[PDB]
Amino acid sequence: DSVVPVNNTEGKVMSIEAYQIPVQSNSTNGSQVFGFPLIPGASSVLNRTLLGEILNYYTHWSGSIKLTFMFCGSAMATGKFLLAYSPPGAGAPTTRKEAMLGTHVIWDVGLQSSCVLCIPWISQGGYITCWYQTNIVVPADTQSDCKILCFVSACNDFSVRMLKDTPFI
Amino acid sequence: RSESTVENFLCRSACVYYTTYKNHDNFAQWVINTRQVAQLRRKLEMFTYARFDLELTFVITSSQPVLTHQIMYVPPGGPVPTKINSYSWQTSTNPSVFWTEGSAPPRISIPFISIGNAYSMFYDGWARFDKQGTYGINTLNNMGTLYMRHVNPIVSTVRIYFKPKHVKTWVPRPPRLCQYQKAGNVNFEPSGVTEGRTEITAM
Amino acid sequence: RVRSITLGNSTITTQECANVVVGYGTWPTYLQPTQPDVATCRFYTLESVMWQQSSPGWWWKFPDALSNMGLFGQNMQYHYLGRAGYTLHVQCNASKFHQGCLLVVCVPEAEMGCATIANKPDQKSLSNGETANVFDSQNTSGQTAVQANVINAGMGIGVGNLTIFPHQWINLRTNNSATIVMPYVNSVPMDNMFRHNNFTLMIIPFAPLSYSTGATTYVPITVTVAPMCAEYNGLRLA
Amino acid sequence: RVRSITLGNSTITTQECANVVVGYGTWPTYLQPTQPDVATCRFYTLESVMWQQSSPGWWWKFPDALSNMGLFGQNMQYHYLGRAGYTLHVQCNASKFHQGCLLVVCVPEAEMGCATIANKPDQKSLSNGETANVFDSQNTSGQTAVQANVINAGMGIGVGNLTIFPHQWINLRTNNSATIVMPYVNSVPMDNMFRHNNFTLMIIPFAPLSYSTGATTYVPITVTVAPMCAEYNGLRLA
């Protein structure tokens, strides 16, 4: 597993902040927290991870991948997130309800500090989105927001076929 | 705990209908209904579903040689009188009793007759969803209607005594707090839960 | 300690120590050919509601609450006659610095009264589908409005007696959740799901929400619903 | 629940539920006569560092970090050739009202780049012995300075890929500690401990420290080191 630079927006790419998905405790209910195209060999989010780097040496590859989401708020913070997966070619949910009617998990951070997905298909696309089912409830007024870290690795027997020059020189 | 059983609580006679008619539109009628008497209604409404047979006893008196009266029962879906001489008074599928003054009062038994498996006391739905005025009407609760006439100037008075028998009930409910407003609905005036006191402490 | 429950393509998390209330002691079972459908047995999570110090309570009518919910909602339209049981999971997100207490109750045949005695309540006032209706703290006024004053649960009874129906209490001091299993209850074995609401879910605070200064001003309440043993009339030749 | 560990004349306390990471799955073992020394197998606790909302991270080079540490530090001078493994205990002191997350990683042969491309970094910028060096949030500028911008871990790699090396995460929400067992790793069985740093310990925040109002503004981080199976060249006639 390596840390995925999900928040790789302009101005964040040059900092450690690229890895830190912000969570606004008082955001609009049902809004999207984050999301991305699920492509390990092309997406800027995944193509520089340990998995992403290895696969850039091969012309063709396939297998499943594992995505781990870790919540880094205070011990006494609670609330729910909706982690949804959109199969290849299905586009991406536009609302929380649409995401809810597809394949997903409700992640209650008060019970589980992390949640793990294994995508049945990753090849040389699909989407991951996360929605604010609830706000984040805390016992006290804090100085800043909460962060989510995302990790990626190969999930099962992953295959590659033909070696090529890396595109990163 | 014998007086607490469902059968002892509900299997008791009540006067549910009082009416008069003359022997000179001169006929009486009553749609069988369990929401006409507040005490009967409040006990039955402590349940959501019920099955029972109905015993009906008729106390008939009259005032100004032998008077004969006809009491007709029209099952759900049967022909209905509109007139004292309507053909429906002679339908073979509408049972009737012929009784004369001086004998014991007429009595008949009507079995559970819904096509559902129970009568419902409450219905969170519509007879037809296209008509909002049908909210709360469950057509499966049609128990039939009674019609009363003299056989052939006097005034007759009829008291109908109703008694549920072999009563089975399901899904208990809170007793009503509010007074009843109408027989065709559950409408109420918002009401407090109890009588008040002057302070929360004892003495 | 923590249990992961997966139905179909949806997963939720509950605690292993959570209690389950099975209404009337009866588990849902399967029952003029009839066709079962297991393709709808997944969790449908409703939009959450926010519990404020002044909230009077919320309600949902069930066959209707799921009427827009994907395939379950579609079977209600393709078939004309059917039945189903439900598992209802109700959870609160609150800190140890929050206090309050809810009654979570499912009421069969919850026929509701109208604000105007002479009228009957309209269809939207009775149910807004997946959107919760709200109980009032005052008397309701309108011509087709549901009399929603919470004190009478909208039914003309005292609200403190709703405990006669399958229910669970949520005292934020000790628990933040409830699970209710509701069997199919009716006078007939199958019915038209668009002309009748088998039961209503009501969530009523009995102890107002409050909290320490600096704590979040509201508590989210989430309702997740999982149909069981759904059956519908067959649509084929004999 | 709580375990007391004594080595030599020093004692520390750890939790029984704490996890231990054994780098590369290998435990340290013993290996031209060579003399073992167990007199140095005690815990050496380094001065703690304070974690602020803006801290970029810290690092230590190990053979050097313990060079002034009593007898271990002396054996490095009396012997010219030797080897050792280490157990590293990293702990945080934080309340339940604090949040944040650290990566605690040990990196073999962590050769670091210079702020000036044409030059090589000086010895002090690479290591300040028992005193931690600090990563920068900005680009470093100097002629002999180590390029310490944390984003590249000072090595020219992305920092998110340091997880390839033996490591443990500390998420204050779930744990306040890490234990890493580092075997001796080199191209040769024994070396000169003053001309080579076998590994570097890096502590890098990935989720900034923050806290509720009124809580302590910083979190102390303590690093305790216990050498194992130390061996040095013999100093006697054959």
XYZ file of C-alpha atoms in Angstrom, chain B residues 35 46 48-49 115-138 140 171-178 181-182 184-193, chain C residues 24 61 107-114 116-123 126 139 144 147 149 151-152 154-162 164-165 185-189 191 194-200:
98
model
C -68.861 3.019 15.312
C -58.165 -1.044 21.251
C -56.533 -3.292 14.880
C -58.145 -6.405 13.445
C -63.999 -11.768 2.340
C -60.862 -10.608 4.143
C -59.666 -12.699 7.032
C -60.602 -10.072 9.616
C -62.559 -6.866 9.974
C -60.278 -3.882 10.275
C -60.801 -1.159 12.809
C -58.312 1.186 11.135
C -57.210 1.601 7.563
C -54.233 3.659 6.544
C -55.215 3.777 2.912
C -57.817 4.641 0.315
C -60.684 2.677 -1.162
C -59.494 4.287 -4.403
C -56.208 6.318 -4.637
C -57.781 8.573 -7.328
C -60.273 9.954 -4.781
C -58.844 11.481 -1.609
C -62.268 11.468 0.017
C -61.981 7.692 0.331
C -59.201 7.794 2.897
C -59.935 5.397 5.721
C -62.579 3.377 3.892
C -62.075 -0.325 3.887
C -64.021 -5.284 3.360
C -52.554 -5.966 17.241
C -53.535 -3.932 20.319
C -53.581 -0.168 20.138
C -53.581 2.709 22.668
C -57.093 3.715 23.841
C -58.325 6.914 22.277
C -57.591 10.045 24.294
C -59.752 12.478 22.376
C -66.159 13.654 16.333
C -67.642 11.575 13.515
C -66.704 7.931 9.358
C -63.193 8.980 10.407
C -60.633 9.275 13.198
C -60.549 13.071 13.369
C -59.909 14.619 16.733
C -59.373 17.837 18.587
C -55.790 17.858 19.963
C -55.966 17.045 23.613
C -53.749 16.920 26.658
C -52.606 13.594 28.003
C -45.039 -9.324 17.672
C -45.035 5.564 5.676
C -47.268 1.672 14.011
C -49.533 -0.671 11.891
C -52.503 0.941 10.137
C -51.565 4.370 11.411
C -54.606 6.159 10.097
C -54.087 9.865 10.855
C -56.630 12.626 11.582
C -57.092 15.933 9.711
C -59.998 20.332 9.941
C -62.524 17.985 11.532
C -64.894 18.101 8.589
C -62.219 16.989 6.078
C -59.808 14.147 5.381
C -56.035 14.701 5.045
C -54.477 14.844 1.587
C -52.044 12.281 0.226
C -49.888 11.951 4.971
C -51.866 22.428 16.841
C -56.241 19.034 4.124
C -53.196 16.992 12.449
C -49.509 17.833 16.975
C -48.851 15.040 21.697
C -51.531 12.936 20.082
C -51.473 12.515 14.920
C -53.920 9.721 15.872
C -55.935 11.058 18.844
C -54.144 8.935 21.469
C -51.670 9.957 24.103
C -48.127 9.812 22.672
C -46.758 8.110 25.811
C -48.797 4.989 24.970
C -47.118 4.321 21.583
C -47.700 -0.733 22.791
C -46.432 -1.001 19.185
C -49.402 -7.338 9.068
C -52.774 -7.024 7.344
C -56.333 -8.395 7.147
C -55.495 -9.968 3.766
C -52.382 -11.980 2.656
C -52.577 -6.086 -1.180
C -50.158 2.013 -3.816
C -53.539 2.163 -2.016
C -52.384 1.165 1.478
C -49.600 1.843 3.973
C -49.046 -1.179 6.148
C -47.206 0.783 8.843
C -45.704 4.132 9.775
